[PDB]
Symmetry: C3
Amino acid sequence: MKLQEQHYHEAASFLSSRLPGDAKTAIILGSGLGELAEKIENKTVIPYNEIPHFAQATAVGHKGNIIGGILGGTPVVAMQGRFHYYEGYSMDQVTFPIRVMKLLGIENLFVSNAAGGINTSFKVGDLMIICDHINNLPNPLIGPNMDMFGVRFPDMTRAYDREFIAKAKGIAQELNIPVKEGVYVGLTGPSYETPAEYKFWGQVGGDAIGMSTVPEVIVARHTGIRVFGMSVITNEGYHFADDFVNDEQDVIRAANAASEKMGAIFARLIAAV
Amino acid sequence: MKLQEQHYHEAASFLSSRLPGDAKTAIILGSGLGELAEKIENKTVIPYNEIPHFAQATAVGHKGNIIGGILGGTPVVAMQGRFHYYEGYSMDQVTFPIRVMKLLGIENLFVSNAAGGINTSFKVGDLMIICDHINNLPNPLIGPNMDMFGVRFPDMTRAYDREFIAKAKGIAQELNIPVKEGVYVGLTGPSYETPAEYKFWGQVGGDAIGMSTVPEVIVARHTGIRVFGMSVITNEGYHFADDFVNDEQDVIRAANAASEKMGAIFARLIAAV
Amino acid sequence: MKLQEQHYHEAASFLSSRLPGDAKTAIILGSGLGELAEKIENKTVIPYNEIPHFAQATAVGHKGNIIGGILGGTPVVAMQGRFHYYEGYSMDQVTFPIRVMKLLGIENLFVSNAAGGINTSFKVGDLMIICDHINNLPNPLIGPNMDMFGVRFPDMTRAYDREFIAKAKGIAQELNIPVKEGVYVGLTGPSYETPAEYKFWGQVGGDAIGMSTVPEVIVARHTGIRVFGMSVITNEGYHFADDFVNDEQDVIRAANAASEKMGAIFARLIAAV
Ligand SMILES: Nc1ncnc2[nH]cnc12
Ligand SMILES: Nc1ncnc2[nH]cnc12
Ligand SMILES: Nc1ncnc2[nH]cnc12
């Protein structure tokens, strides 16, 4: 009850005394995307293992650092690597960083991920602006409500900020970067989906599928952080070849290759919001 | 397992020592609806925190009392307020009162709740007779079966008693209270749905969405209790205005507003079952 | 992370001392299909209670024996009965034997089950080759990956081996046994589905529904085990009579009736792999 609040405060104290403290935007760097850290200038690198009550990062392609610094001439806090429910963690553990971000004075959260394309018009390499999601992981707010952070029953009507989507599209046009928009479906994993599951999710309004994001987005919105999301389509959950197989490394490679274009958007978006 | 039997009997023994005992019908008053307890004459009020093994009603707009008395000239046991999975309770705790009712001799259970309308003909203020449900919460029966209560694989072909539905429609017709009929979809919450979730659930057959009712209905049916169920449509999960937000007090005020019409149907229905 | 490896090794070592160790194919016999054990000759029966770390079979119609011997002229190992999530076992518990089978040198898993039909052409007593599934149970791979068995993110594009399906098809034709083909939807249970739920899964591409099998397959696929799946349709989740109920004993009856034909396919199939 009082112990939980105190844990947030302890993690936030620790970061505050190591970070500048002027950043209003945090960025979550997903599976193929951790090397966008290279674009952050004047880096203060804080390993998750050093931070009170942060989980200890086990997913492949997830380094596990808080990075303080400058992106698009703008103070930033990045999560290099993110936690996932498939790792064994509770939702409380997965989303812990988002509430620590609130305590640091973060107002905007940009979130990226590697996602499977289930809209048959999305192809490997495409960047998708997340316009909405479907949650199929346990809701992260289950349990007693942390009133310090928000209301018992938060609105999810526009989880993905309309102004941010508008500005990101404007920016993509400026930069000659094509973007898609659509609905991200959040599933636990960690196995990739069967064709039947892919077809199911596409049939009910899914455009892309992955294993993160939604929980942190629900927790962000619960505490009034404005959210922008961007998937990299790293594989196509349709048109299967007779001997096709999804692969951890092919997803990471495909995200790696789209990192520079997504990074460019994030760099100008951070200065725009 | 006899430990759990011990628990049920202790709660039943306690309640039976305070209640008249002649009630054959129990009612559950949901978010709208604690006001219906004013319509019960000769009340005997039993705080949940006095009853052995009863969980505590932490949900806002849920008082947490058993209330025996007379409704429409008929003996009743009411649950003024209820338990929800989003609270952090186990399904066992959420549904414990249902099994206690059984041991008290309750044969019928009228469930009411607040619900979002997902079919576009369902408007704020509408009363919707639940004629079926789709479960998206953990099933309350996972675990060793409690043989004292029911079979291992209970049937759920007509969970919402047809006879009670037919009577209610008649009673509605007599009282000139227009009623809708449709499928209730139960999610965990506690965050309201996204438009993509609302749309998904409407696509597959849902008419209204709530965070309750399904677990209790399953357990009631597991133990042969006949179920009538009605939602108040408190908000419309479709045709979203650009700045629309879902809200807890908005739902409660909508439920309150509709209370009386629901109350009138329940009082005549209890008298005719 | 290190303790669990040992548990798998203790179980396999216990089984390896009692079995002759040349079986390459294992078979799971589900509800009402335990009788198929009669086909197996030179049986060595090893009750689950004896094997280190095996859970207890608690589902009616599930004896809980590992049986070694000869079926179809071929060494086999059979799980006579299986575990289910609805029993309250963790997915680690439910799927533990599959990993134990891998350590025994099992290369091929033949999974059977009883299932409700949601395809309207699928009638009581029909045999349905599973060509894909939709998982609606907790993913059994959640938590730290066991690297000694498989990769963090294993592929489920062809969970049900295509050559095994072709062979089953040809065999069924030879034996003059009508077969069906379709997508099995895995649900937790234990309560049977509502008409609304049967309709949902039907709409989204499910052909049959049950409470098993999907965890074992994910777990088998994770460790490279080639899988063949067959359902017996033991009920029709459609066109419900006014007074129809599902019934555990009815389901067991139907599977019984269909044992002989499933076993005749299994016996030919095991010798053809
Ligand atoms: N197809 C897919 N489904 C779920 N998560 C993923 N992460 C990368 N590709 C994915
Ligand atoms: N739209 C909605 N979703 C879930 N629970 C509710 N309770 C009232 N309205 C609701
Ligand atoms: N209709 C049904 N639903 C779930 N599991 C089953 N097993 C056999 N019939 C079933």
